[PDB]
Amino acid sequence: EPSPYVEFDRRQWRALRMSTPLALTEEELVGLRGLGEQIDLLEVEEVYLPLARLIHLQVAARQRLFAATAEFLGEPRPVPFIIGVAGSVAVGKSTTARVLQALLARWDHHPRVDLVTTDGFLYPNAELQRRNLMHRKGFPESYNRRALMRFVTSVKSGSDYACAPVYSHLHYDIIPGAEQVVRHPDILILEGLNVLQTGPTLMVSDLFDFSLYVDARIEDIEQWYVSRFLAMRTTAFADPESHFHHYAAFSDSQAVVAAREIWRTINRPNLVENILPTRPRATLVLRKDADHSINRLRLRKL
Amino acid sequence: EPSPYVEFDRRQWRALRMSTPLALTEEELVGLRGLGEQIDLLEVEEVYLPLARLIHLQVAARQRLFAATAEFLGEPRPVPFIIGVAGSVAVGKSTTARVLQALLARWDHHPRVDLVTTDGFLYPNAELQRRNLMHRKGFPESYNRRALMRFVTSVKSGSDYACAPVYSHLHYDIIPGAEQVVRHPDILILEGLNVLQTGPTLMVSDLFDFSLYVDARIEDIEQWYVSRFLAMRTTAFADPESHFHHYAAFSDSQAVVAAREIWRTINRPNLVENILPTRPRATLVLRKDADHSINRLRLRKL
Ligand SMILES: C[C@H](NC(=O)c1ccccc1C(F)(F)F)c1nnc(SCCOc2ccc(F)cc2)n1C
Ligand SMILES: C[C@H](NC(=O)c1ccccc1C(F)(F)F)c1nnc(SCCOc2ccc(F)cc2)n1C
């Protein structure tokens, strides 16, 4: 029974590592780890290094394809390779993305590898209040998807620079005047929630040369979300300038109630209605277990 | 203002022809022309030959990409290149597809180029009657899209053969027992209506290495449809075995009434609600004028 997919387990996948150096020290790993994440050097080696090898093979071949079009066109720093990383809140895709960026940037030919999270493209709160969308922050309509598409297009067009706006998780809002400048990289990783989504018109997913989806049982992500929420009381919420400082004095059980409620009404439905439906398109799915461990992968060979 | 697209006119596009031989005689052209079509050798040269050049550049480069994945995978007749041709009924995509197939098969390296129309994947009439779908023949739900996806996947998987069922336009139904065998080509052109469409799960559009969309003003396609309908009275409908023989004795004005009605209730809405929304994804759009002439094109350079 023929398939566009190939399943692996860590045993099979780790084998595919070949002679790929490990250029990442333990000090550096944890400086990319997010609160709650269990990723160790043994996982970089056995999972992210094959992945990095795969990606670097394809970067070369993917550009030949743009060569062909430019040769047709009778034409005279290539077309940036674009990676998308998607997944639910709290699944740890943010970390994956940051790890991936460090692994790729340390290829001996030394490419420039920018990383942009989509949260800088959320509408500011006042704009969200206007549209009646606060209660749906993180859903697709709470993003300026036109702005976001222009940006990625602009970068891939080979343009000299592009700017993105900047979100502050501290203040739960877009930072006035702040901007992230992306000066023509070789690779761009774009990380967000529904970034793999498909539409009537053309969308960023269409621009992706490679894409990555970080998966887990829905019960387990709830678990990680709630724990991280509780942990955030002595972290992010502890700062008296946090938009969410009021949460710092919640007890374990109020905190679990609040966390569960946000999860039930905002984060779970977005996952189910929007994010999860996009899994089938992803070049690679990283499947995590309850203990955070990546033990199965699903690659698109077609 | 940067764009994924490049517009052309026939002047600009024809220039891109380079030294591409014309291996198609006028006898052979018209034997592919459909009732009403105005395509002449001057259009093959100035439009289909650039197109053929473009396609043959990309076939080479697109396979390097599957090489990269197989080299990663540590692996030991390549992965068939898959072209999709979409557009409304009566726009003449059927012809384009057949022309394209003849132009590609006569490349000096002599590749096998199969062509499959999607109509063989319509549900038989009795199955359509069951689902209450006769009045929506040609809409996406009147196709066995699972069967269709299995097929294209099977071919691209590199499998030795795949079978498709066969529709009879004469009898307005699927022919019992008939089958079209596709024995591992180098290129497969797949022609149909919503074939460029996108979904929750993975679909044929995802398997396309190249895609082609044949466009025209909606008023003009109505015009061509109605004329062809009238013309079909002394052609297809003239055969007393035609499911539609009753139409042969319609006068011009009854015939125009019938044709307009079918167009209003079945073919126009499908075009508007489903087909036309898919135009943005197509690698190349062929834009035809009221006189049938291809005078502008839109290529995806990203
Ligand atoms: C609906 C809202 N979503 C977001 O703020 C959001 C939107 C887009 C991208 C990322 C987030 C994020 F991660 F949660 F901050 C939200 N979801 N949880 C909260 S409470 C703030 C605590 O933030 C987190 C973030 C991540 C966790 F794993 C646990 C708690 N809020 C305000
Ligand atoms: C709704 C139905 N659609 C189809 O049969 C159909 C479905 C899928 C693919 C192609 C067709 C096709 F082209 F019209 F035969 C239909 N549309 N017009 C008719 S009348 C039969 C006359 O066929 C045509 C076909 C094409 C024309 F340009 C003009 C008349 N019928 C029965």
UniProtKB/Swiss-Prot annotation, chains A, B:
CDD domains: PanK. Pathway: Cofactor biosynthesis; coenzyme A biosynthesis; CoA from (R)-pantothenate: step 1/5. The keyword Kinase applies. GO terms for biological process: coenzyme A biosynthetic process. Disulfide bonds: none annotated. Keywords: ATP-binding, Coenzyme A biosynthesis, Cytoplasm, Kinase, Nucleotide-binding, Transferase. One of its GO terms (cellular component) is cytoplasm. One of its GO terms (molecular function) is pantothenate kinase activity. This is Pantothenate kinase.
